[PDB]
């Protein structure tokens, strides 16, 4: 695992089923009690990042 110096990541107004767990060794990570998944990349950012998309390649 890669330990980052700056960690300005947080819940960021998580949607639903998100829990910000702060650990001294594991660090700050969000756990989903719905998809039993845990990752560093905040969901609020991802969704709002791939959602803000106004125009893009249409496929269907």
From Swiss-Prot:
Recorded superkingdom: Eukaryota
Subcellular location: Cell junction, Tight junction; Cell membrane
Location of Phosphoserine modifications: 10
Tissue: Widely expressed with the exception of skeletal muscle. Isoform 1, isoform 2 and isoform 6 are highly expressed in colon, kidney, lung, liver, and pancreas. Isoform 5 is predominantly expressed in brain and heart. Isoform 3 and isoform 4 are highly expressed in pancreas and brain.
General function of this protein: Plays a role in coupling actin fibers to cell junctions in endothelial cells, via its interaction with AMOTL2 and CDH5. May regulate acid-induced ASIC3 currents by modulating its expression at the cell surface.
Subunit structure: Part of a complex composed of AMOTL2, MAGI1 and CDH5, within the complex AMOTL2 acts as a scaffold protein for the interaction of MAGI1 with CDH5. The complex is required for coupling actin fibers to cell junctions in endothelial cells. Interacts through its WW 2 domain with SYNPO and through its PDZ 5 domain with ACTN4. Interacts with cytoplasmic domain of ADGRB1. Interacts via its WW domains with DRPLA. Interacts with ESAM, LRP2 and CXADR. May interact with CTNNB1. Interacts through its PDZ 1 domain with NET1. Interacts with ASIC3 and AMOT. Interacts with FCHSD2.
Name the UniProt record assigns to this protein: Membrane-associated guanylate kinase, WW and PDZ domain-containing protein 1
Lineage per the UniProt record: Eukaryota, Metazoa, Chordata, Craniata, Vertebrata
């Amino acid at each position: 695992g890669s330990s980052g110096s700056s960690g300005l990541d947080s819940e960021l107004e998580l949607p639903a089923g998100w829990e910000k767990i702060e650990d001294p060794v594991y660090g700050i990570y969000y756990v989903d009690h719905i998809n039993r998944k845990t990752q560093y990349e905040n969901p609020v950012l991802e969704a709002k990042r791939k959602k803000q998309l106004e125009s893009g390649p249409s496929s269907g």
